[PDB]
Amino acid sequence: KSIFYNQVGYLISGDKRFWIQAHEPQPFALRTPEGQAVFAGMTKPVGGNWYVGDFTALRVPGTYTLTVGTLEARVVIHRRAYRDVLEAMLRFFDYQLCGVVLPEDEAGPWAHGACHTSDAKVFGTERALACPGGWHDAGDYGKYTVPAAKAVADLLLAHEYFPAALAHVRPMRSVHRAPHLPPALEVAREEIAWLLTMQDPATGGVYHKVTTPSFPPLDTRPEDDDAPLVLSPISYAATATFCAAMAHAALVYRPFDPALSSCCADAARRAYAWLGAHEMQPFHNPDGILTGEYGDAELRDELLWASCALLRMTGDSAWARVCEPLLDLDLPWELGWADVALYGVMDYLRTPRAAVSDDVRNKVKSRLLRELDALAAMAESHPFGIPMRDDDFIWGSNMVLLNRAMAFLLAEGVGVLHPAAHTVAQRAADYLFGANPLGQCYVTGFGQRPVRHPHHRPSVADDVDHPVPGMVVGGPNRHLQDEIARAQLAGRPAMEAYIDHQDSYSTNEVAVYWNSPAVFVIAALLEA
Ligand SMILES: [Ca+2]
Ligand SMILES: [Ca+2]
Ligand SMILES: [Zn+2]
């Protein structure tokens, strides 16, 4: 028996919900710490085990004691409830920084020295080049181009959608170059910078990843990882995904860093030149390389995104000839890392409408709305109001949820205003912060049941008891895709297929592209 709620808190002007397992309505009260009832209501069935208590009408800020039946809970209402968790979600990218000293005054207990500072050998050859900076991808120390592109795209979109909300947030500012950019762009730049080093000059092609041949033990501190670095071969996926991220960066950084902006635009055009002279061949790990593959068989949604990004970057109507036939395809319109068509949809919809066929544009917006309707229909049959169903609870189910909430919010910028856009965004935050069958807050160092044991090298390696805060875990994975999950979570419903265990990498790992949609969604909720 337990009350299920958003354990970070609620916005004064936001919807306020709690969940309980019950088979009957039942009264509830919210109280000041001294015990005085301030709000009273009745619970409502959402089926089957689940009942819901709505306390949206309570607009007074403060800490409240929520009581229903014989259960009690600590509830926080604040005009800016999600500020701290937002900062921490953004600061995570700075905690992931490679090849740069993280001082104790910024990083606290999780401070460390500049790691992976050696040059990397181009696979097969005897050449070696520096690819320093950027982010450790996930629980490991690999730096992969494809998932990196999603991470930067999300942070750039977050800045240009919700700059005011991100302004209240502070990164590891002293680690970064001065003058200091807005928090989202400041963080994203390190990664845009690492990444420009990943492009082969005299080809324009981009190396798929820079990793050690295999994973170090879960014990390895960032700077005890002294295995040689290798650059896996140039891939179509990495090149096209690089092209779209750089063309995106070229636009956004224009008023902040003209030199970076111009450098990214030229890098994007060179990458697209490579795509036109090469074959859409899926990446596979070369022999001897055992790290994260980030493979993918479909590369048309990558070409789509790369084409639409250059369409918006240039405003040149000539790009629409390439983009629009690709937008017709029955590709899933998703937000990566493998299926990136929706990013292309967004750059095309945000392109000035004069440089674009208005007939195709209406079809694209019509398909987007119909989808949003499909996601809305899922949300209204789910007890927790999230656009999910059992089969969606796969590896990184939290990202699946966050991307879908992001899709509702992105669409508001292109004239597609779905009525459920903001309740879904709130329900997504609630679920992520504890409103789920496990009562589990899926972010490290937050809520009343925080993630304690993430599959995260620096968190496992250190003698620090608490993990790096602000890390969003993958979430419930029905496919039980690691030994711990198999032995422990067999036969439980999809939403309970999670264990806070450090060896459960398929349910409890972190990722740079799992934090990036979280930053977008939380920044959306903060900006009213
Ligand atoms: Ca793809
Ligand atoms: Ca620790
Ligand atoms: Zn490193």
- Of 435, 432, 434, 452, nearest to 444 (Cα)? 452
Query: Which amino acid is it at 513?
Result: Y
SS3 501: coil
Query: Where would I find the beta strands (DSSP E) of 190-349?
Result: 207-211, 229-234
Give the CA dihedral 103, 105, 107, 112, nearest 10 degrees. 30
Q: 381 CB contacts (<8 Å, ≥6 apart)? A: 389
Q: What is the DSSP letter of 95?
A: H
- Cβ(97)–Cβ(175) below 8 Å: yes
CA 62 to ligand 1 center in whole angstroms: 46
527 belongs to an annotated ligand binding site = no
- Of 524, 501, 394, 528, nearest to 89 (Cα)? 524
248 belongs to an annotated ligand binding site = no
Residue 493 phi/psi, 5-degree rounding, is -50, 150
Q: Which residue has the tokens 């711990």?
A: 484
CA 467 to ligand 2 center in whole angstroms: 5
What are 439's two structure tokens?
Answer: 């009562």
Region label for 108, one of left (φ > 0), alpha (ψ between -120 and 50) or beta (otherwise): left
370, with CB counted inside 10 A (0-12, 13-18, 19+), is exposed
- Cβ(341)–Cβ(349) below 8 Å: no
Experimental method: X-ray
* C-alpha to C-alpha distance for 52 and 20, rounded to whole angstroms: 7
* C-alpha to C-alpha distance for 175 and 427, rounded to whole angstroms: 35
Nearest ligand atom owner, CA of 131: 3
Active-site amino acid positions:
455, 500, 509
Region label for 480, one of left (φ > 0), alpha (ψ between -120 and 50) or beta (otherwise): left
What are 40's two structure tokens?
Answer: 């009273």
- Of 243, 253, 401, nearest to 307 (Cα)? 243
Buried b (16+ CB within 10 A) or exposed e, 60-73: ebeebbbbbeeeeb
List, in order of start, the domains of the chain with CATH numbers. Answer: 1-79 (2.60.40.10), 80-528 (1.50.10.10)
* C-alpha to C-alpha distance for 472 and 308, rounded to whole angstroms: 30
Q: H-helix or E-strand containing 145?
A: helix 145-161
CB-side neighbour CA atoms (13 Å) of 174? 7
Q: H-helix or E-strand containing 423?
A: helix 421-432
* C-alpha to C-alpha distance for 390 and 380, rounded to whole angstroms: 14
CA 99 to ligand 3 center in whole angstroms: 5
CA 241 to ligand 1 center in whole angstroms: 9
Using alpha carbons, list the distances in angstroms from residue 524 to 163, 164, 354, 406. 10, 10, 29, 9
* C-alpha to C-alpha distance for 20 and 23, rounded to whole angstroms: 10
330 belongs to an annotated ligand binding site = no
* C-alpha to C-alpha distance for 216 and 234, rounded to whole angstroms: 24
Q: Which residue has the tokens 């040149």?
A: 316
* C-alpha to C-alpha distance for 156 and 307, rounded to whole angstroms: 18
What are 507's two structure tokens?
Answer: 């349910």
Taking a 5 Å cut-off on Cβ, the residues next to ion ligand 1 are 296, 298, 301
Instruction: Give strand pairing partners of 144.
Output: 209
Q: For the sheet with 120-122, list strands across it.
A: 128-129, 120-122, 229-234, 207-211, 143-144
- Of 396, 395, 397, 422, nearest to 407 (Cα)? 422
462 belongs to an annotated ligand binding site = yes
SS3 89: helix
* C-alpha to C-alpha distance for 181 and 185, rounded to whole angstroms: 6
- Of 178, 181, 161, 158, nearest to 170 (Cα)? 181
SS3 93: helix
Q: Are strands 207-211 and 143-144 parallel, antiparallel or unpaired?
A: antiparallel
465, with CB counted inside 10 A (0-12, 13-18, 19+), is exposed
243 belongs to an annotated ligand binding site = no
- Of 290, 286, 285, 274, nearest to 241 (Cα)? 274
SS3 185: helix
* C-alpha to C-alpha distance for 185 and 160, rounded to whole angstroms: 10
CA 20 to ligand 3 center in whole angstroms: 44
SS3 249: helix
Rg of the chain over Cα atoms, rounded to whole angstroms, equals 23
Region label for 261, one of left (φ > 0), alpha (ψ between -120 and 50) or beta (otherwise): alpha
Q: Which residue has the tokens 């900076």?
A: 133
